């Protein structure tokens, strides 16, 4: 289970190669589903399965 | 030899066929963004609720 | 992907059955018995 900045969901959280633009925080799929998500506090991109 | 021709060109001989993968994954779309959808409900969230 | 989200709601996609390769050998043998 996890919560980031307030988004919430449960998900396997894994390093991601998608490539975010700076401003951003969510990535989303084509189903408007959470799919990837970046760490506040250590800038990465994770997945969210 | 031009059969091989007319497929190497062709994306709507196979028509039937698209049309039929594109239906299911279409109504599959559908099926999920009715997830997001209020209802009349306050929101489309479960828990939020 | 797609079929991730889809995935993720509890919609599920069974494989088929017959995998391709088997599929080509049906369509290999009636091809071939034709023959």
Redesign the interface.
């Given at each position: 289970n996890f919560n980031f900045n307030g988004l919430?969901g449960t998900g396997v959280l894994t390093e991601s190669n998608k490539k975010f633009l700076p401003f951003q925080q969510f990535g989303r799929?084509?189903?408007?589903?959470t799919?990837a998500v970046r760490d506040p506090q250590t800038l990465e991109i994770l997945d969210i399965? | 030899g031009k059969i091989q021709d007319s497929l190497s060109s062709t994306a709507s001989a196979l028509g039937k066929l698209q049309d039929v993968v594109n239906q299911n994954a279409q109504a599959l779309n559908t099926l999920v963004k009715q997830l997001s959808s209020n209802f009349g409900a306050i929101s489309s969230v479960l828990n939020d609720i | 992907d797609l079929i991730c989200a889809q995935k993720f709601n509890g919609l599920t996609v069974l494989p088929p059955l017959l995998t391709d390769e088997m599929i080509a050998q049906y369509t290999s043998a009636l091809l071939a018995g034709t023959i």
């Open positions: 919430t799929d084509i189903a408007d589903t799919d399965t | - | -």
